Amino acid sequence: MIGSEKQVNWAKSIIEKEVEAWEAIGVDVREVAAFLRSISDARVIIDNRNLIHFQSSGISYSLESSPLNSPIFLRRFSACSVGFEEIPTALQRIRSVYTAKLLED
Known part of the structure; x- marks a missing residue:
């Protein structure tokens, strides 16, 4: 991972x-989780620390509103990560599975 030591x-x-x-x-x-740990530019992580933040307090909406749903947003990680092409598809799946989990109740 590139950047200053503190970064x-x-x-x-x-x-x-x-x-x-x-x-x-x-x-x-x-x-x-794999995609997140693949990001190799410390400055890019720091700059986007709040935009990507996943809020614990409302999972369904955090999932549905996550910028990881957006190909345009993920373009910023394109030169410093692995698997960003498949991430919006991943979120569709996760949303689909987590939604079903809750609604079986």
Whole structure:
């Protein structure tokens, strides 16, 4: 991961918080977690730390409104990540599975 030492430290911390947030949902998010840990530019992570933030307090809307649904948004990670082409498809799946989970009740 490129950047100053303090930039990298901060960026690695942001990513682990977001991975935690997605993994707290309770459905398979391995592909999203993999994509998040693939981002290799600390400055790009820091700059987008708030735009990508996944809020614990309202999962369904966090899923549905996430900028990870947007190909245009994901273009900013295109030179410094792996798997961004498949991420909107991934979110469709995760939304589909998590929605079903809740509505079986």
